[PDB]
Amino acid sequence: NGLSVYQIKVHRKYTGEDFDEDLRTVLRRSGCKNEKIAFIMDESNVLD
Amino acid sequence: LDVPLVLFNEVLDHVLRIDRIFRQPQGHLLLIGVSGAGKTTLSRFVAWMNGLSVYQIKVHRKYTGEDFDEDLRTVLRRSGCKNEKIAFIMDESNVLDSGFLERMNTLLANGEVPGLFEGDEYATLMTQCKEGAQKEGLMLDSHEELYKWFTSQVIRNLHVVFTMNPSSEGLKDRAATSPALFNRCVLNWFGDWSTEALYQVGKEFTSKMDLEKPNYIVPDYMPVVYDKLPQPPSHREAIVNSCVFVHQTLHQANARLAKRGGRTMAITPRHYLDFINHYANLFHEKRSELE
Amino acid sequence: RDPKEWIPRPPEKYALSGHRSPVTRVIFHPVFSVMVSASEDATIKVWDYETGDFERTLKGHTDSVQDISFDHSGKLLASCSADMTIKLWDFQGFECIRTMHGHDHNVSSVAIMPNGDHIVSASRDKTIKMWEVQTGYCVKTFTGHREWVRMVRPNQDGTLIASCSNDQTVRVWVVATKECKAELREHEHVVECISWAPESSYSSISEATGSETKKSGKPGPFLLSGSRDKTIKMWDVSTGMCLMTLVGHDNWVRGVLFHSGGKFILSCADDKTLRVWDYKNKRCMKTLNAHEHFVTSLDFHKTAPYVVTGSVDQTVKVWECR
C-alpha cells in the first residue's frame, strides 16, 4: 500500500522518554512530511 | 594499534614529556619534528595510557571549513557534555585554510568557540549540557552558567596535540597566525632522530641477526660516526655504525643536491626503518639460500 | 500504416525466449535493425526483430542486469546490474571495455547523455551519479532523494535529468549546476517509470491540455511518471503542475513512453496488459493482452513500426503496428 513500516526498537534502558521521542518522530513524519506510516508495535514493546 | 616500536632513551623521555601535559588542565602540545619520527604514535600511546580518546579529523580533497566546524562541534560535545577525556591530535597538513587556525586559536586560548554553536545546534548543546550538569550533581537552569560549566568541562577534558615539521619560515608565520599555538601550547622539539637514536635502533633491530665475526680486525683509522661507540668495536657495532653512516650520507646527499638546484625528497626515520628491515630480510634470505 | 499513427496490434510477430530469468528491460538499437534485452540471469541477449532470431549473449555481470541503454550512434551500450557495477560495452566487438564501481547498493538505472560523453545512473543508495565515458570517473553525485532511486532519464538536449524513487516523488535536476529544478510529488505510491516528451508532441500536449501558447514559443519540457498506484501522470517541468492523470491500468505501471509521432502514449503494467493512451481525450484506446505474467518494460522504435515488451515470463515479444 506504500506505507512506511515503523517499529520502536526497545531494550532494557528503553523508558518513557524514548517512547515519547519515537512518537514525536512518527507524528512529525506522518503529519508534517505527509508520509503514510504503518506503526507496528507488539504488546511486549509496552514496558509501561 | 598493532605497529611495532623500537624503544630508545629519547622515546622514553618523549613519552614522559607527553604524559606530563596530558595530566594538566588545558594541557595542549605542539610537537615539532621530522615526519615519521613517531610523534602521532607516541601521542596515541600516551593517550591510551592516560585514558584519553584519540580524535583525528578525516581530511580529504573535498574537506572544507564547515566539515571542520562539525568535527569541532562533535569533539566539544563529547569532551564537555559527556565528560570525556579526548586527545585531539591535529597535524599541520590538516590546516587547509586560515579559518581552521582561527578556530584552533580561539579554542586553545579561551576553551570555547563563541560562534561555533548557533540555532538548533546551540539548543541541542544546551540540553546536553543540562543533562550533563544533572549527571554531575549540579542544578543549572539558565543558559549562561550552563555554558560556563560546558567551557570549564572542555578546558578540563580536551587536550589538543599539534604535530608539524620544523620549517623556520613556517614557524615564524605560525607565531603570528596562531598566537595561542605558542602561548597556550607546550612546545616539544622532537626534531630528527639523533645519531645515538639511530645507533640504538640499529642495534636493537639487528640483534636477532647473527652479525658475529670473531676474526674481525679493527681498522687503525675507524670511521667513527656514533660518538659513544666503544673504542675496540665488535663486528655488530661496526655494522650499526655503517648503517648510521648510510643515513647521514643520504642527509648530506640531499643537502648537496638542493645546493646545486635539484629537487630533493626529505629523508625521514622511516627510511632508516625500511633500511634495517631490508637488511634483516636480505640477510636471512641470502643465508638460507646459501645454506 | 500512417507514418505517425500506427499502434501495436494483438497478433504478435515473434515471442523470443532464451532468457532463464525475468526480462528486466528491452531497448531498440538506434541504427541497426537489432534488439537488446536485459534479464535477471545476469545476461544481455541480443535479438534481431525483422526475423526474430537470437544473435549473441553479452555476459560479464555477476548479478541481475537492471537497465541497458544506447548512445546516439549506437556504438556503445551501458548496462547496470544488481552487483553495484556499471559496464560499458563496445557494441561493435561486443566486449566490455570498462567497469565502473562507486555505487553503494543495487544500481537500478543507467542512461547515456545525448552528447554521448557522460553516463548517468541511479541506485538504491538514494544517489544519482555521473560517469565520464572516456575515463570512467565519477564526476557528479545528485543527492536529495530520500529513498531508492528507481530510474534516471535525461531530456532531449541533456540539460535536465528526471528521476523517480521509492519516496513517491519525481525530481527534475539541472545537469550543469546539480540543483533540483522541481520536485513532482502527487503520486500516492512508489513511482516506477518516467519518460520525457519528444518535441513532436509539444503542440499535441499543449492543445490537449488547453495550455495557452507562451510568449516564448517553448511550451516547456513535459514528463510522465508511471507509478504503483496504477496511474500515469503528465507533468509540466517548467511550472511543476500535473497536466493530466491517466487512469485505467489494473496494476502497477512498469513502463511508459510516447509514440514517436507524439500522438499517443504507450504504457505497460503488471496487469499483463500493454495499453495505448489517447491523451488528446485523456482515455485509453487499445488494450493488448501482452504477456502471461507481469510486463516489465516496453520500447517503441523511432522509425520502424515495431513495439517490443519484456516480461517476467522470460519472454520478449515483438509487435507489428498496423
Added chain:
Amino acid sequence: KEWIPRPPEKYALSGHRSPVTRVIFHPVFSVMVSASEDATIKVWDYETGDFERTLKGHTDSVQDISFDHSGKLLASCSADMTIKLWDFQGFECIRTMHGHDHNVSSVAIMPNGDHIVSASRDKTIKMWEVQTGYCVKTFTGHREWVRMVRPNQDGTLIASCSNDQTVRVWVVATKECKAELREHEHVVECISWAPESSYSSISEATGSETKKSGKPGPFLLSGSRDKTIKMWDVSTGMCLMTLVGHDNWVRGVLFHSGGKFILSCADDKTLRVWDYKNKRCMKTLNAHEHFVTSLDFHKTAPYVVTGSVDQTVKVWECR
C-alpha cells in the same frame, strides 16, 4: 539451412571422470546437458563453455537423458534400474520411478509432456506417467536388449531398436507392432526419425510415390554396428537408401534441422556428414582421440556437441 560443422573447435569441455554416454541440447535456454558413466549429469553453457552444475542423484552409470517440449523437466535413465525425473527449475530430483528390471538403456518424453517411454535389457519398453509415476502399459515383443527408443512429433508412434536386429514401431492407442523391420546385418544401436521439414526432401531423394492421401508418411532411420546407416519408411516398411562408408560401429544418428543433410557419429573416432538427395556431401571430421559416443544438433543455433569415451565433451561451430 546449410549449417555444417567445421574442423576447428571452440570448447572441449572435460569435467567428467568417466566416459560420456549422451549429450543433448536444452530446448530454449543456452544450456547443454551431458550424461556420463560416473552416475552424474553435468550442465554446461555451450555458448561460452562454462561448467554450471551437476545432478548426482543416480547410483550407477547414467545412460540416456531427455528433455520435454517446454524444457522444464529432465528424464534420466541409468544402470541402477531406475528412471529419475529432474525438475530443471531447481535441479532437484522429484520422482524416481522404479521397476523395469535390469539395465535401462534409453528414455524419452513424448511431445505431449505427460508420459515417458524407456528401454532396457529386460527385453521390453515401458510406459510411465510424469504426473503420477505408475507404469500403466508395457510393450513386449523384442526378444533381446532394446538399445534406443524414440517417439514421434505428436506422441502417438514409438520405435525401438534392439540387439535382436529388429526395429519395431509401436502405437500408443493399440499397443501393437504395426511395422516390424528385421533386415540389418548386425546389431542396431541408434534410431532417429525425420522432422516435417524434410518430408518433401525425401520424395526427390528416393522417388517414392505418394498415396491417395498424398502424405509421404512417417519416416524412420536406424543405425547399426554393421557400419551402415539405413533410412526406413514407417508407413510401408521398405528401404529408401543405405548409407555406407563408416569405418566402425555407429552410435548416434540425427537429421539436420534444415532437413537436407545427414550428420552422425561412430566408433571410428570421426564425425561424418553425408548427403543423401545427391550424395555430394561426404565430409569426414575427426572429433576425439578415442571412441565417440553421442551427439546432438541445435534446433536454431549453429552448434553441435559430441560426447566421447575420453571423458570430454566438445562443441563445434556450424558454418
Added chain:
Amino acid sequence: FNRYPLIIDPSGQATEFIMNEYKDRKITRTSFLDDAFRKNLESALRFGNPLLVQDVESYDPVLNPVLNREVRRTGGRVLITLGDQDIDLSPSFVIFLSTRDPTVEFPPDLCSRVTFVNFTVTRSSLQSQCLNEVLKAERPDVDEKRSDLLKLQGEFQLRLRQLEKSLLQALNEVKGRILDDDTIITTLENLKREAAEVTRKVEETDIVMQEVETVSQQYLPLSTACSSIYFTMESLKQIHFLYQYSLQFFLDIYHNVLYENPNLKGVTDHTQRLSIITKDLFQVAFNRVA
C-alpha cells in the same frame, strides 16, 4: 618494498609494467581524481586486490592509515579503520601510487609514507633505443634477426637453468644409491644430452649474435649523437622555464628524420643514407626546438 611504492614515470612505461605484472591478480587502475576512489579502495582492501592509483599529486589523506599500516589485530582478523568504518584487511592487498610529473613536489609526510621509485631516462637506455630504432628503419632483416636471437638466447638460458635445477633435484631425491634404480640413470642421461644440445644451440646463436653486433657497429655514433642531442634538449630548461621538452618530442623528431625524410627518396647506399640521416637529424632537431 616495505613502504608502498610511489612510481614516477613520465613515459608511462612503469605503469604498464605494473599492470602487466599484476594482471593475473586482477589489478585495478584507479585515480585520486575519481569521486568513487573510496569505494574502489575499500573493495581492494576487503578482497585483497592489487591497486594502482594515478594523479598522486591529488593524494587523498584517507590512505594515511593504509600507507602507515595502522592495523588492529583482534579475533584473528586484521582491522583497518578506513575513515570511520572498519574493514578486514586481506593480506594480499597492495597499492601502487604513480605520477607522470617528474617535477612535482610532495609534502614531507607523503615522502615518509611511500617508497620513491623514479623512472628516469639514462644515456645508455636512450642510446640502445635509438640504435634499435635506426636498425629497424635501415636494416629491418637485421632487426628481426636480432629479436629472434634474443628470444632464442632467453629460452636457451631458461632451459639450461631448468636442466641444472632438475639434475640437482634428481641427485638429491634418491632413496638410496644411483645404480639401485635404472630410472635415475635414464633421467640423468636425458638431462645431460638436453644440456649438451642446448649448449650447442647457445654457441650457434652466439656466433650469429656476433655478426648481428658487428653489422650494428656502424650506427653507434648516430645513437651517441641522439643521446647527446636529447640531453642537451632536456637541459634547455635551465635558461628558460618555457623550454620544457619531453622524450616523446625527441622520439617524434627521430621518427620524422628516419621515415619522413625527403632526402632518403632515392638513396640506397647505407653509408650515404646514414650520413643524410645524421645531418637531417641535427637540422630537424634545431628546426623543431628553435
Added chain:
Amino acid sequence: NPLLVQDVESYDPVLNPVLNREVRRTGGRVLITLGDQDIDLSPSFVIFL
C-alpha cells in the same frame, strides 16, 4: 565470531531481527538491519543463548 550470551532471562529485544533472520540479499550479499545500521551479515556467525 560465534557468540555465546548468558543470562537470557534479561533478554535484550535487539536480537529480534537477528533471531528472526530478517535479512535481504543483493547489494552487499546478506544485509541485516540491526536497529538503524545496515550491518552486513557474515555467514559464519552463530549465537547461543
Added chain:
Amino acid sequence: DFQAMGRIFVGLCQVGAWGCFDEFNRLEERMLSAVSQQVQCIQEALREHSNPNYDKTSAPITCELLNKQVKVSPDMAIFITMNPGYAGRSNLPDNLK
C-alpha cells in the same frame, strides 16, 4: 564580471546606446579576457550590418550574448577609458586590445 558586462552589453545593443566604461582596467584580467569575446561578437554583428547587401526588410542583425540572440542596433558603440600608469591595475589581454 562576465555576466554583468554581458547583461549591460545586451541592454546597450537593444537600446542602441553608447557604452563608456571608465576605469576599464579595474576589472580582473580573466574577466577582461572573457569580455573580449562578447565585444568581438558585438563588433562582428555591427560589421555584418554595414555591408551593402543587407536589407532592412530581411531579418534583423543579432548576436549571441549570454546564450541568447540579441538584436544589435547600428547606433551602439563601446568605449573604454583607462589609466595605464596606475600600478596594480589589470593588463588587458592582447586579443581584447
Added chain:
Amino acid sequence: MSIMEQPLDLTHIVGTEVKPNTPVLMCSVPGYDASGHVEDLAAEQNTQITSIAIGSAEGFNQADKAINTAVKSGRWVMLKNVHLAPGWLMQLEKKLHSLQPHACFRLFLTMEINPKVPVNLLRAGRIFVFEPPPGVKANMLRTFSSIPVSRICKSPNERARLYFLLAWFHAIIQERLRYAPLGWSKKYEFGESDLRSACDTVDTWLDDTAKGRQNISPDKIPWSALKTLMAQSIYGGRVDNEFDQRLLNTFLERLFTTRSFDSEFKLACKVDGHKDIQMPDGIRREEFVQWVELLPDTQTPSWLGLPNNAERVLLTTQGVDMISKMLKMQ
C-alpha cells in the same frame, strides 16, 4: 639557421608534424597574439574552429564541451589567454592525456610567456613562440606573407607600391623599439593591429581617389590623408610624447611622398657609410617580395636612421648572456 628567418609555416606543421593528442601551445611575448594566425589558418583550410576566451566558469564549461565535441567530430578548438587559469590548465593536461581524438582534431592554446603556466602542460604540447621578427627583412617578409595576394593586387597598379612602403614603414618603426631610449622614448605597442588599420586606410582612400582606374598619377594619391591619419589615429594614437610624435611625423613625411615613386628614391641614406638602400623599380607584389628576399643579411641600426653604435652595448650584453647560458647547462 636560415629557416628561423622565414615566416612560420603553421599550415605544414599543423597538418603533418602535430598529432591530434598534442595541444598546440602558442606562447607570445606581450604585444603579440597568435589568435589571428590560427583564425586565418582555419579560414584557408575551410576548417571550422571554436574560439573560447578563458577566464569565466561558463568559459571553462564551453571549453570542455567544445573539446568533447571536437575530439569526435574532428573540428578545431581555440582557447585564448589560458595562462590566466593554471590549475585548470593542469586539469586540461590530465584530460588530454587519456584521449583518443579524431584524426583532424587540433587544440590551440593561446597564452603569453608566463612563469605560471604548468610545466606538465608545456611538456605535453608543442610550443611555438611568437615575438618580434629578428630584423627588418624578416619583418617585411612576415608582413607580405600575412597580407593576402589578392588584397595587394587590386585594380590600381600603385597599390602594390603603397603596400610595400607601408610594410617598410612598419618594419622600420617596429625595429626601432629594440633600442628603447634611442629608437623611441618608451616601448610602444606597434603591432599587427596598427598595420591592419593602416592597410585598411590605404585601401579605403585609394578606392575613394582611384574610381576603379587601372593606373593613377603619383601626385593624385591622397598622400596628405594617409600621412595625417597614420600620424594622428593609427600609429600616433599610442604616442604620448611630443618628440616621439615628431619622429613619427619625420618618418611619414620622408616615406609617404610622391618622390617615393621615383626610380632613385632612397629608403635609407648611408647605411654602411657608402651604400644606401634603394627604392625598387617594380610595380607588382612579386617584384617587391623578391627585392625583400634579396636584402643583405648584414643589418645595422643605420637602416633605421639610428647611429651604428646604438647596438654595441646590447650586442655585448647578448654575447655575455650567451656565454652564461652555455656555461649554465654544461
